[PDB]
Ligand SMILES: O=P(O)(O)O[C@@H]1[C@H](OP(=O)(O)O)[C@H](OP(=O)(O)OP(=O)(O)O)[C@@H](OP(=O)(O)O)[C@H](OP(=O)(O)OP(=O)(O)O)[C@H]1OP(=O)(O)O
Ligand SMILES: Nc1ncnc2c1ncn2[C@@H]1O[C@H](COP(=O)(O)OP(=O)(O)NP(=O)(O)O)[C@@H](O)[C@H]1O
């Protein structure tokens with residue numbers, strides 16, 4: 001049997017989407033799925049972790065990525081989502097750098113790197129309706145993102161013509177994803193990316209790749225709108241149908257390969273007749289789509305068979 005090892009925190013390994021996909025991968029005649037226990041991941045040396053021939057492993061809060069890296073170096077499995085790139089995905093500066101290198105449209109942006117010992121010495125000038133970051137001007141509205149991609153406290157600053165103030169976004173809590181603040185001045189501690197505000201129809205397109213030739217997309221109300229979350233009777237956030245155009249399918253292909261994340265989520269802003277990537281999240285499954293579960297499991301199983309069947313002497317077509 002070809003062994004597919006799943007190495008992530010229990011919140012992710014035991015999530016409904018994961019269980020749905022793993023039960024389908026297990027239907028492959030020659031594949032056995034082994035899910036690494038969280039206590040093993042956290043507390044056992046990598047020399048004691050189960051063997052696998054193919055490793056599906058990804059970082060989330062609390063995950064020891066150094067250990068996953070060392071395990072992959074020790075056992076040299078076929079890796080679905082590259083582990084070293086998951087360090088880079090944690091830093092928005094690195095993500096935007098890669099997007100640019102790949103010719104991928106993204107918002108105009110500038111990085112404000114601030115010395116926490118000398119926070120006033122950074123290259124920021126503030127006016128009432130703009131900032132200048134390293135000399136580069138952003139007229140309001142503009143967006144201010146923590147350099148850490150794991151920090152979801154993204155702020156939007158409104159122009160005086162709109163009443164000023166700001167929208168403070170955050171990881172959703174029940175009914176809300178953002179709140180208005182009367183504060184018009186930018187944050188004065190921390191490092192940020194400042195970027196131009198892309199006007200959309202008030203929705204975000206969320207894209208989910210399974211390899212570079214498959215992507216599911218769906219739309220959700222932008223948290224930047226009023227911050228009330230649309231929920232169904234099951235308490236799931238409301239999603240809207242999307243079909244990606246030819247340009248956007250290429251974007252997905254590029255993102256998947258550039259970040260070496262077979263399973264990869266990222267966000268698109270449909271604005272001004274083009275589509276701009278504003279965030280790359282790495283490993284993420286679509287939730288609540290039976291067809292995606294089927295498709296994702298089939299594609300992953302096929303990738304495993306295509307790579308490893310010859311060395312196992314298993315016929316595969
Ligand atoms: O980006 P999408 O596709 O919306 O997935 C996120 C997911 O949103 P949803 O389940 O509503 O789609 C987020 O779930 P959450 O916002 O809690 O959803 P809900 O309000 O239904 O409980 C998840 O956050 P966490 O579980 O609280 O850490 C959030 O986790 P994060 O990646 O932001 O933080 P992590 O916990 O991974 O460090 C995401 O889960 P993932 O992509 O499966 O990891
Ligand atoms: N340049 C922009 N112009 C307009 N809206 C933006 C822009 N950047 C971000 N947004 C909006 O703000 C939301 C959050 O920003 P995003 O860069 O996705 O932060 P995040 O903290 O990485 N979210 P997550 O997808 O949960 O990891 C997006 O989904 C958009 O609705």
Ligand SMILES: [Mg+2]
Nearest residue numbers: 026028029031
């Ligand atoms: Mg099986």
Ligand SMILES: [Mg+2]
Nearest residue numbers: 267278279280
């Ligand atoms: Mg996002």
Ligand SMILES: [Mg+2]
Nearest residue numbers: 149279280281
């Ligand atoms: Mg993100």
